[PDB]
Amino acid sequence: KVFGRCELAAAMKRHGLDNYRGYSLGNWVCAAKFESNFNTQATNRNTDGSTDYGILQINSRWWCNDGRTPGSRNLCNIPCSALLSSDITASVNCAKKIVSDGNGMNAWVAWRNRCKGTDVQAWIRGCRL
């Protein structure tokens, strides 16, 4: 599913991501834009052989099992394919673990390089939330 911007904002808000660990909703929408272009089916292989899955590009080295990543810890206890669903529940519940792991949203490369320090409230402009 390719979400609309405000559609995704409303879903992320429903699941409690607004100001989760202090990160306002626009941070999460910005991250999803630049990680996946709002596409739940996005997958991208990393140089280390791991793959990133879904709307928030969650990585198979630590967080989900894809059966092809040596040393996978599967800390979210899910198959990576569950992160590709049109229902974002699994991605959100895993992202809450990730953002609580110590480095905050710096875990997301696209957030660090493209959202951090910018006017992230623009990402929720116009949305009825």
Ligand SMILES: [Cl-]
């Ligand atoms: Cl933080």
Ligand code: NA
């Ligand atoms: Na893993």
